[PDB]
Enzyme design. Structure first.
Site, short mmCIF file in Angstrom:
data_model
loop_
_atom_site.label_atom_id
_atom_site.label_comp_id
_atom_site.label_asym_id
_atom_site.label_seq_id
_atom_site.Cartn_x
_atom_site.Cartn_y
_atom_site.Cartn_z
N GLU A 1 -14.47 36.98 -54.57
CA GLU A 1 -13.48 37.34 -55.58
C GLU A 1 -12.23 36.48 -55.57
OE1 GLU A 1 -14.13 39.23 -58.02
OE2 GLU A 1 -15.76 40.52 -57.33
N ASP B 1 -10.61 37.49 -65.31
CA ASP B 1 -11.83 37.37 -64.52
C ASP B 1 -12.92 36.58 -65.26
OD1 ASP B 1 -13.12 39.12 -66.29
OD2 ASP B 1 -13.12 40.82 -64.93
#
EC number: 3.2.1.17
Length: 162
Positions: free
Chosen positions: A11, A20
């Site tokens: 991440e 994202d």
């Protein structure tokens, strides 16, 4: 290696609001803020999550606090889900981390829909499960991360994370 180190690799860590892989406002270690395209809605969610006016920026401690909450919540989601719990409980510690990783990224409902992969994993048919896991939007959209997670499911080792 543990689940926190694994997800930190997958991440990243960013202290300012970013989008994202799906274009959604996020912060920290993959903490989704909202699916709204309004940056102000994301900032409102951020301030609510942190408990202060952040103006789109947080500290490393704050990011790690959200990450603790998000991992905890992912695990508890698994344990409350009638489809996921027995498969999770059937797994060894390393493969359990792969399961948490997938739920963290895709959400509990998404993973609960992976019926054939779930069955193969519970059966410990590792190569077959790995082939099935890759036949997915998930794999096609994030192949390098999915390959790591799938190798973890296939082998029960941390080989893909060095």
């Amino acid at each position: 290696m543990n689940i926190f180190e694994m997800l930190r690799i997958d991440e990243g860590l960013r202290l300012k609001i970013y989008k994202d892989t799906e274009g959604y406002y996020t912060i920290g270690i993959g903490h989704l803020l909202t699916k709204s395209p309004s940056l102000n809605a994301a900032k409102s969610e951020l301030d609510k999550a942190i408990g202060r006016n952040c103006n789109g920026v947080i500290t490393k401690d704050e990011a790690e606090k959200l990450f603790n909450q998000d991992v905890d919540a992912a695990v508890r989601g698994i344990l409350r889900n009638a489809k996921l719990k027995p498969v999770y409980d059937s797994l060894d510690a390393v493969r359990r981390c792969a399961a948490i990783n997938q739920v963290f990224q895709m959400g509990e409902t998404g993973v609960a829909g992976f019926t054939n992969s779930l069955r193969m994993l519970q059966q410990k048919r590792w190569d077959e499960a790995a082939v099935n896991l890759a036949k997915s939007r998930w794999y096609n959209q994030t192949p390098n991360r999915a390959k790591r997670v799938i190798t973890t499911f296939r082998t029960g080792t941390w080989d893909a994370y060095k």
